[PDB]
Amino acid sequence: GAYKYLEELQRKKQSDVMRFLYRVRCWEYRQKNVIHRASRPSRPDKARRLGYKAKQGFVIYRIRVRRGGRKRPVPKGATYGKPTNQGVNQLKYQKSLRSTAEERVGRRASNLRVLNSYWVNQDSTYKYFEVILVDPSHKAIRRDARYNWIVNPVHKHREARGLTSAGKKSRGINKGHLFNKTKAGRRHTWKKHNTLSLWRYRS
């Protein structure tokens, strides 16, 4: 079908065609509201890859998030501590702009569950993301055996808890030796390695 072609063409982002389309769509998205509803995915193939289905109860929001690092929000740059903590500029947020996009969209549409999200476009001031959300109160979702799971309350604001793909990426939830500190949760691992376990018959 056409989804393979769509996939292969979106990988040629520096071709003339894709550059023209990105210019035009960046202008239009910058001309709209920071958060707005998208009538449809601008990348149907990418949405399909990320779990979107053209059903009632699947929703798309486009959101615009400011680029760059995280300036320390201390008044006049005074940190009141030791010189190792005096940095104000060149500091970085530990979450991605994709995660920030997801969280702001989920906050705006608080009745939906954030399924996933993807990058759509970019300029010097903003990155643009499209967030795939699912309505858990819609019967087309509740009677769907492949999407009942997100109706259960342990998935309330999963994007706020880092349970989406972007969130698990920023949390370091991967297998292997390169993720020793964060495999099962960084703070959980630290607490486990800093707990004194004492038994009845001390060994």
């Binding site: 393979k4 072609y5 292969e8 063409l9 071709s15």
Partner: protein, 97 residues
């Protein structure tokens, strides 16, 4: 298959080898007719990137060493730079007819 002793080249205990059926996951890098066809049409529709055109100019101007240095500066690694320069030489050979 092993030397039967604990030191040297090919050390370890001898066992009777059993032929292993290859896993289908090991075919991941193989190409298919579907992806070759789709990629050829997408190359025709999309065209070339600016750095790929610059690479082609260096190769045409006999700057193989320059084209390698550019392809590594752009793509990031020497292995990928080697494959990109080989692909752009094959592109020139497919553009000379």
């Amino acid at each position: 298959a092993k030397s039967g002793i604990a030191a040297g080249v090919n050390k370890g205990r001898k066992t009777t080898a059993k032929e292993v059926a290859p896993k289908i996951s090991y075919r991941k890098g193989a190409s298919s007719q579907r992806t070759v066809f789709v990629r050829s049409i997408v190359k025709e529709v999309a065209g070339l990137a600016p750095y790929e055109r610059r690479l082609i100019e260096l190769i045409r101007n006999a700057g193989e060493k320059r084209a390698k240095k550019l392809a590594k500066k752009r793509l990031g690694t020497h292995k990928r730079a080697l494959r990109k320069v080989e692909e752009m030489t094959q592109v020139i050979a497919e553009s000379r007819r």
